[PDB]
Design a protein around this ligand. Sequence first.
Ligand SMILES: [Co+2]
Length: 205
Amino acid sequence: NEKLIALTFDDGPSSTTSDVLDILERYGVKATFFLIGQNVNSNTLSIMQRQVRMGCELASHSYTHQDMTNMSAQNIRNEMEWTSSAIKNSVGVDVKFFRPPYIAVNNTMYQNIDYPFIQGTLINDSENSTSVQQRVNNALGAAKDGQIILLHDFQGNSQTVQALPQIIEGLKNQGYTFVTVSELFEKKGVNPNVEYKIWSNANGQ
Ligand SMILES: [Co+2]
């Protein structure tokens, strides 16, 4: 009767990431970080190393974080390969999932990206006008068994850092167990590797 939640973070690594990690470590919780490839560099190495130490999953958010519906097939493929190899060659882990920038997806992307697409429920934590407590309530209201929840850890997103302790404490209080996206599919016995699909819940609905 385990109830699984996959907390996920877009747009890092950034210095804000380290504050997210401090909180995840405090609560013994793992998350998934969809990284922007050009943010994988010597300035972010120690953060990515700590992500791997804590068993947080690293995934792909493209290399330049542009709207990939305006990109050629070749450029899409280069973005994906460069992001995966940057993550593999820096800290030794293999990307398993892709999340499209801006959740902008078209046929060309689906034809030229070999990873499962992840969306999840947005909590609108990219705009400062969304308060700490709005972020808390949106995350708590989006939770259900098997659900992926989309947050951001771009530099400066301190209102999500402020929101995260209530979110974790509240979901545990509701009986949820935190998993990575890989762990989510593994534990539900679901094959994520379905082409032409974008997932928000391990049930695929
Ligand atoms: Co993004």
